[PDB]
């Protein structure tokens, strides 16, 4: 199930992040109530700090495609998101030594920056 | 810079024109009585005018006898000249057919798409286009679907072509919570697939446009779910129209 | 695929219709009271197809025809409810049968059609007999067909339509009526047997040596043809068993479904035929254009498909040989791009009074000759605009004539295309 | 217009009301929209007494319409043997041509009026006359499977 995104074993979390990344490509622009990674943004704030470098990077690219699937209406709730998300993104995504873990974290911040009215 | 409606022109009243020997002539057993009766008000009373009276004019006595013939009248000629009357009302009296008027003729018209005589299908469909362009999608969206599910092959292909006609001229902009989305997957798509999967090719081929005119409106990604369930062979026919179709 | 609903419309419709019921009632061993006095199981094996009492509906705007049927020999057997008749007649006006007077009555007919279909285990389709030069049989028949086509679209529509000829009625509006009716049949029926009065007269006059053929004389040839083509349908048999299978193996292109029927041997009204023909003789009444019920020369065109029905006790080995022979010894006359397009079937029960017989149903492109004749007469009439006020007065538009004219010519062109086609 | 009432009568076939309208000096050769005189219309619809009435009052026996149709054309088309011989006796054009190139012999042959074909022939009809497409009356019998007509055309 989806609740396996917080499962103990890493390779089962790694699935859920890929499963999610599909969801945000393949699900509805209008958006299923199953797309509730807005009104609890603590979820992905947790996922970005995964405690596994490979399953972390996969959570960030799921957050990334989520965070561009949200350029559809109405998502005025991007204020809450920047508060919850970019501190984890900066603290441990930009920080990362991993080439791709960093590159997608910056891209994520970009997408949160243009969610906002200004910088 | 805003534009004008040319409709500001003063209106004309036709109620006084009708003759005493009209109700009995339309309700007669002799076909030529009915035809002439209808044909007279069309060539003499409706065709001349260019704007009917919005204020305080009840046509829902006249319109319900146009329906009575369009549905049940055995004379295909009396149907043809009636649906052209219906169109004239809906055309010269825009913004009138809110419900009572539009709904009084809507389901009769959809029944009579069964007619295959080109001149008659011309007149019935063009009148359906009138009631739609001034009442879309009040009652038609629902009832148009109903008659896509109908047993006669002709009414299926014609009422589906109707949804196609309407969909090309479908209008914005509320939020994306218009009547089309409330019932999109639940009803519109489930019913358009019944056309797409019909036994006849000419029926199926109308569905293929009416699905590619649908994707154009509501995103080829949203409907990729029932696309997968469809044949790979039907898929490339649907896509064929998607590339040509405009809304 | 079991039951068939039968319809007869107009004067001709009920004439050749009743004659047909006379013929196959005897063949199945039914008396005019409606009781079995046969002596074979192959007679009641598929009696459920046409009977319940016939599954027959009788239609005419002309009320007189009612009595001409019931006062006939087997007139007592038809269900009284299944008679549906108008007050006045159409008077050779197709528009009156299709739009005005015939349309007012057509609902009453569909009510009976529904009734008879309602109590069918599994319907096959329908069977309409009618003339094309009339007003009722053509105008109301074609309107009935379309009205059934849309109420029963999962069923076969099979017509026995008889073509007008100056040799049988000098009425000049018949080309109009028949052209308008062909414009319907090409769009509305799965298969149509073209019975040509031109050819029925030419057979009664030249082959049977009757100086003045009556309707009864022409109707004898028709009723015998109908029992012949319906032999597969009415008795047990492997090939061309039901209406759909027949049409599947007979009609390669939907619009080109006009069969040129013909059968053998040609007998007179109750005359004696000493020495029953041999199998090779029967087989050699196929190309023999003097046996075609349509006035066309198979030599002048090509067969797309052919169905042969041999009736009587005879050598299945010899029939196969003779048919396999006549095909390849005339190989240029059968289309090459349809392999095994000729199909033969045998029924052991022969026709009435004859030891052997053979009916020859053929989709021959030569049939374009028939539609040529009708169109030239139509155009000659239409270019001078004669009698148009009849049709237009009944609500018809002058345009309709042009469309029917053009649509029949497209039908002629299509036949000409596939005639000149090559396999290479 | 009194010339238009005489067309209405001669067509629909009210023998008596022709005499009434003609006694009021109606135009015996009055043309309708397409150039059809009353003699055309009576000869189309088979009103023999109306034909003979108009002819003896000076009807143009060889009058054409907008399409070159003489009354003998229309009588031979519809098959009015009684009228054909009346027209011919009043000096009708046996080999008249119309806009489509047809003679009266073409029309009587197409419509299978064998009795009228023989009358026209004996009044010196052109058996070898051709139409627009290039077909004679004899070609029509060949094309239309009418061996009864082929024999009557070579008599
Ligand atoms: N073979 C045959 N042809 C007929 C018979 N009666 C009429 N016809 C033909 O049918 C045409 C006239 O149409 P008819 O059926 O009498 O008119 P309806 O009653 O309005 O359908 C003409 O071409 C006639 O030659 C008949 O008993 N047998
Ligand atoms: Mg009749």
From Swiss-Prot, chain C:
SUPFAM superfamilies: Tubulin C-terminal domain-like, Tubulin nucleotide-binding domain-like. Gene3D superfamilies: Helix hairpin bin (1.10.287.600), Tubulin/FtsZ, C-terminal domain (3.30.1330.20), Tubulin/FtsZ, GTPase domain (3.40.50.1440). It is found in: Cytoplasm, Cytoskeleton. One of its GO terms (biological process) is mitotic cell cycle. Its cofactor is Mg(2+). Keywords: Acetylation, Cytoplasm, Cytoskeleton, GTP-binding, Isopeptide bond, Magnesium, Metal-binding, Methylation, Microtubule, Nucleotide-binding, Phosphoprotein, Ubl conjugation. GO terms for cellular component: cytoplasm; microtubule. The keyword Ubl conjugation applies. Some glutamate residues at the C-terminus are polyglycylated, resulting in polyglycine chains on the gamma-carboxyl group. Glycylation is mainly limited to tubulin incorporated into axonemes (cilia and flagella) whereas glutamylation is prevalent in neuronal cells, centrioles, axonemes, and the mitotic spindle. Both modifications can coexist on the same protein on adjacent residues, and lowering polyglycylation levels increases polyglutamylation, and reciprocally. Cilia and flagella glycylation is required for their stability and maintenance. Flagella glycylation controls sperm motility. Mg(2+) binds at residue 62. The modification Phosphoserine is found at residues 40, 165. There is a cross-link at residue 317 (Glycyl lysine isopeptide (Lys-Gly) (interchain with G-Cter in ubiquitin)). The highly acidic C-terminal region may bind cations such as calcium. Belongs to the tubulin family. Dimer of alpha and beta chains. A typical microtubule is a hollow water-filled tube with an outer diameter of 25 nm and an inner diameter of 15 nM. Alpha-beta heterodimers associate head-to-tail to form protofilaments running lengthwise along the microtubule wall with the beta-tubulin subunit facing the microtubule plus end conferring a structural polarity. Microtubules usually have 13 protofilaments but different protofilament numbers can be found in some organisms and specialized cells. Interacts with NCKAP5L. This is Tubulin beta chain. It comes from Sus scrofa.
């Amino acid at each position: 199930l989806e609740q396996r995104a917080s499962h103990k074993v890493w390779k089962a979390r790694l699935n859920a992040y890929q499963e999610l990344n599909n969801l945000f490509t393949k699900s509805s622009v209008i958006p299923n109530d199953v797309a509730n990674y807005w009104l609890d943004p603590e979820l992905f704030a947790s996922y970005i700090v995964d405690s596994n470098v490979v399953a972390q990077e996969n959570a960030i690219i799921a957050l990334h495609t989520l965070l561009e699937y949200i350029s559809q209406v109405p998502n005025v709730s991007t204020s809450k998101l920047r508060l919850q998300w970019i501190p984890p993104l900066v603290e441990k995504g930009l920080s990362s030594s991993r080439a791709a873990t960093k590159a997608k974290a910056t891209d994520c911040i970009m997408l949160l920056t243009q969610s906002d009215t200004s910088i | 810079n805003a534009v004008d409606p040319f409709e500001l022109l003063p209106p004309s009243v036709i109620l006084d024109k009708f003759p005493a020997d009209f109700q009995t002539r339309i309700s007669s057993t002799k076909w030529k009585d009915r035809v002439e009766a209808l044909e007279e008000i069309h060539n003499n009373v409706l065709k001349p005018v260019k704007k009917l009276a919005h204020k305080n004019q009840d046509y829902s006595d006249y319109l319900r006898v146009l329906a009575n013939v369009i549905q049940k009248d055995a004379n295909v000629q009396a149907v043809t000249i009636a649906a052209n009357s219906v169109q004239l009302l809906c055309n010269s009296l825009r913004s009138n057919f809110t419900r009572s008027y539009g709904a009084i003729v809507l389901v009769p018209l959809l029944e009579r798409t069964k007619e295959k005589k080109p001149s008659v299908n011309e007149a019935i469909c063009s009148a359906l286009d009138a009631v739609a362009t001034y009442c879309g999608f009040d009652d038609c969206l629902e009832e148009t679907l109903n008659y896509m599910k109908h047993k006669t092959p002709q009414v299926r292909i014609e009422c589906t072509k109707f949804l196609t006609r309407m969909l090309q001229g479908w209008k914005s902009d509320g939020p994306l919570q218009n009547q089309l989305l409330f019932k999109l997957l639940p009803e519109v798509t489930t019913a358009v697939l019944k056309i797409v999967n019909d036994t006849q090719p000419t029926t199926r081929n109308t569905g293929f446009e009416c699905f590619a005119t649908l994707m154009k409106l509501v995103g080829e990604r949203e409907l990729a779910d029932p696309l997968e369930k469809l044949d790979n062979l039907k898929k490339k026919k649907i896509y064929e129209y998607y590339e040509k179709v405009e809304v | 695929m079991r039951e068939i609903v039968h319809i007869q419309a107009g004067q001709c419709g009920n004439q050749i219709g009743a004659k047909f019921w006379e013929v196959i009632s005897d063949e199945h061993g039914i008396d005019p009271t409606g009781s079995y006095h046969g002596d074979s199981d192959l007679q009641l094996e598929r009696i459920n197809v046409y009977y319940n009492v016939p599954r027959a509906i009788l239609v005419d705007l002309e009320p007189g025809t009612m009595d001409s049927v019931r006062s006939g020999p087997f007139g007592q057997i038809f269900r009284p409810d299944n008679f549906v008749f108008g007050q006045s007649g159409a008077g050779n006006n197709w528009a009156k049968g299709h739009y005005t007077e015939g349309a007012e009555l057509v609902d009453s007919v569909l009510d009976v059609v529904r009734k008879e279909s309602e109590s069918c285990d599994c319907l096959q389709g329908f069977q309409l007999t009618h003339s094309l030069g009339g007003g009722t049989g053509s105008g109301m028949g074609t309107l009935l067909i379309s009205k059934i086509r849309e109420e029963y679209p999962d069923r076969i529509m099979n017509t026995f339509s008889v073509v007008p000829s100056p040799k049988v009625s000098d009425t000049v509006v018949e080309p109009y009526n028949a052209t308008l009716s062909v414009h319907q049949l090409v769009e509305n029926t799965d298969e149509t047997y073209c019975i040509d009065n031109e050819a029925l007269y030419d057979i009664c006059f030249r082959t049977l040596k009757l100086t003045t053929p009556t309707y009864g004389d022409l109707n004898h040839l028709v009723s015998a043809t109908m029992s012949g083509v319906t032999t597969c349908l009415r008795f047990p048999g492997q090939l061309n068993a039901d209406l759909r299978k027949l049409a599947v193996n007979m009609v390669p292109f939907p619009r080109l479904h006009f069969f040129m029927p013909g059968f053998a041997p040609l007998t007179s009204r109750g005359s004696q035929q000493y020495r029953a023909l041999t199998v090779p003789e029967l087989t050699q009444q196929m190309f023999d254009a003097k046996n075609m019920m349509a006035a066309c020369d198979p030599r002048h065109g090509r067969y797309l498909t052919v169905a042969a029905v041999f009736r009587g006790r005879m050598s299945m080995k010899e029939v196969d040989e003779q048919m396999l022979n006549v095909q390849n010894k005339n190989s240029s006359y059968f289309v090459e791009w349809i392999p095994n397009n000729v199909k033969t079937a045998v029924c052991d029960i022969p026709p009435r009074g004859l030891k052997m017989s053979a009916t020859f149903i053929g989709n021959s492109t030569a049939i374009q000759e028939l539609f040529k004749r009708i169109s030239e007469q139509f155009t000659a009439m239409f270019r001078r605009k004669a009698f148009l006020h009849w049709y237009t007065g009944e609500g018809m538009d002058e345009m309709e004539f042009t469309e029917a004219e053009s649509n029949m010519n497209d039908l002629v062109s299509e036949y000409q295309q596939y005639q000149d086609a090559t396999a290479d | 217009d009194l010339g238009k009432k005489l067309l209405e009568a001669a067509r629909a076939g009210q023998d008596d009301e022709v005499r009434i309208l003609m006694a009021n000096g109606a135009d015996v050769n009055a043309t309708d929209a397409s150039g059809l005189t009353p003699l055309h219309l009576a000869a189309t619809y088979g009103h023999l007494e109306i034909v003979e009435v108009l002819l003896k009052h000076g009807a143009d026996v060889n009058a054409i319409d907008i399409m070159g149709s003489t009354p003998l054309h229309l009588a031979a088309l519809i098959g009015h043997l009684e009228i054909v011989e009346v027209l011919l006796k009043h000096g009708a054009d046996v080999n008249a041509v119309d806009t489509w190139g047809d003679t009266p012999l073409h029309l009587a042959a197409i419509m299978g009026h064998l009795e009228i074909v023989e009358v026209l022939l004996k009044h010196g009809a052109d058996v070898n006359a051709q139409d627009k497409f290039g077909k004679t009356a004899f070609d029509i019998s060949i094309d239309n499977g009418n061996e009864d007509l082929a024999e009557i055309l070579q008599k």
